[PDB]
């Protein structure tokens, strides 16, 4: 979103989007899924820690590396940059590792069904199963958990360094032009406080946002292949793709209509920060001179701070009305859609469980993003502050 | 935890704890649950929005008000304070509203079983149930959701004002003694940046922490009355209270052993903040004078900042190893405990579902607290900074 990284941001992102679309179209249905080496299609290793060593996953890794390599080799000659390696390859690696973690989560999800089957068989007929099978199954689960832990730790470490690299680039570029840039009010805050909060906020709210989109993309095909049993939606009528449209619309609206409703919030934190800077400057001048910490001026500055903060707190009531209601209704959205299908007698028990489980695991990814909306507000305010400062 | 609020913190908290214990003992089993007015015991209104109007809940509200009134009337004469009303009554009200929200959540939980029963009956025999019963049930759910929304909005608003009152008290008390307190390094940051972050962090991490303890206290009796079917724990032997000890130990260790493991983390953010202050001061001096923004000094300050931040990022690997592992194993802890009971053939199907559901809803409250551990680290660092500054 900046110019310190990202060699030419005007055309870099367009090229990234176009190339991503071309590659995805080629792989998914473009007939590019032909595997001449070894037939790993229509058959995969069962649930175990070796699931990530079969030739299918190796082929996917190779394809991803080839695509990223072509893109990077184009851009490294089209337009050189000092931070090119981080700005391109680190982003690619972060996206890849997030996808890998979603896959590991799906594997843990799949491991549950046979264990429940074994438990049910033990409860019904006990002379078939012993304790050894249980210990073996727990061993397999620990095998998956170890890989999850190992990848997650390094993911966090690399994300931290990448974000700090971004902060270094921003600070260097601002301080390069400090002479004609200090005349703006609150200049000292822009380059240090704002950059720190941007780094810390993006380290926390960036991974979560990519993870939700990845979860939706991962679970979409199951709803595509399962929406043949739901022909009607409650107050819509009859659409050809029942569950996919419902899920996409629900998630997109829950993320976007809240932003539209609370569009005025990020414009208040701005003013809040300004008044606080006007406060802090005085104290910094007062830490040496004894004549600059007089009571009345401190009184006036704190009075202004209070007056702005009260208005900010006031403008959260009509946002919380929407957010809390959306959270409350979301728990039964996946069961609301099935009223006409039950009375029509089309669906059966067990398929209801599949739909409900899928919708629940989809909701789990956006729950954390919605529950922490103050951080997004702070990030958006930081974006506006830096953008206004850049001109 | 301070002296600006809380008239005499040395003896106030001890009195609060003792009085809370006395009241709880009197009500729970002290025989104080006699209701001479109307017999609401051993019978309650079914699942509806009127559940919070029966004489049982009114009696509880009256008892709570009487206890808080006695305590406040004692302290308002024992030791006067300027902020007494906020410091006592606001805390009481916040705790009460959190309990109320947990109760509403329990009601929504209970509403599920009959709806599934109706759905199953519709699936088996369709000539009994029509669409009107479904619409009525959805109406009842909306009735509960409305109360949830209305209470939550005002809860957030009041918490915001109470926290800002705390910040006002702290700032007034520090600025009262500014002359002999400015000689400490980084004084300007203590009174403005640290107070702001303390307010914003406590507004977010305070409610979540109280909510988890309230959830545990609410669900404890069910495990007390249900642990008669589990006589053995996996590698423990035979204890008289199976599930209660397991739940309490699991939650307490997951919250506390992580803190013990990462005890060294809060001591690093301190230094981080110091170096950043040493940076910002220079820029604030440079916003007017043109001879104080020389490149080399900025270089040295940023070099120090980078050197400290790298060490901080390094010390998260061995903390994430524990945190991610704890999150990963927690998903199957409630099913691990039941291996000996299944092979012993004591428990039956359906009771397993109850145990698993209870443990899942207990885990849901601590999941949000564990997933956001950076905020707790920041809060603890703020506490240490202010405590060191106060002496
Ligand atoms: C202003 C607009 C800005 C837009 C910015 C964003 C632009 C767009 C983002 C793209 C990143 C994500 C790419 C992948 C998206 C799709 C996600 C995904 O999982 O796709 C897989 C296929 O992917 C594929 O073949 C696709 C391969 C794509 C390879 C990479 C190409 C783009 C490189 C970009 C470099 C960084 C650029 C700068 C970013 C900021 C599906 O596999 P599938 O389930 O069948 O299982 C196969 C096997 O493992 C057996 O299960
Ligand atoms: C250094 C140490 C510091 C320690 C600081 C903390 C000190 C301790 C905290 C206490 C707050 C919470 C009190 C309540 C704790 C127990 C929580 C609770 O829900 O207790 C209920 C009974 O409570 C009761 O009778 C108890 C009534 C207690 C009334 C209030 C007394 C204390 C007032 C304090 C004022 C603020 C002081 C300063 C705090 C910072 C159970 O009902 P029950 O499920 O049977 O359903 C009945 C009916 O509704 C039908 O279901």
Swiss-Prot record, chains A, B:
CC annotations in GO: plasma membrane
Pfam families named among the record's database cross-references: SbmA_BacA
Phenotype when the gene is knocked out: Mutants are resistant to proline-rich antimicrobial peptides of eukaryotic origin.
Annotated InterPro entries: ABC1_TM_sf, ABC_transporter_sub-D, SbmA_BacA
The keyword Transmembrane is assigned to this record: yes
Membrane topology: Multi-pass membrane protein
Domain of life of the source: Bacteria
Record bears the keyword Cytoplasm: no
All ranges on the Cytoplasmic side of the membrane: 33-56, 109-137, 227-242, 353-391
Function: Uptake of antimicrobial peptides. Required for the transport of microcin B17 (MccB17), microcin 25 (Mcc25) and proline-rich antimicrobial peptides (such as Cathelicidin-3, Arasin 1 and Dro/Drosocin) into the cell.
Family to which the UniProt record says this protein belongs: Belongs to the peptide uptake permease (PUP) (TC 9.A.18) family.
Full protein name: Peptide antibiotic transporter SbmA
Species assigned in the record: Escherichia coli (strain K12)
The organism's taxonomic lineage, starting at the top: Bacteria, Pseudomonadati, Pseudomonadota, Gammaproteobacteria, Enterobacterales
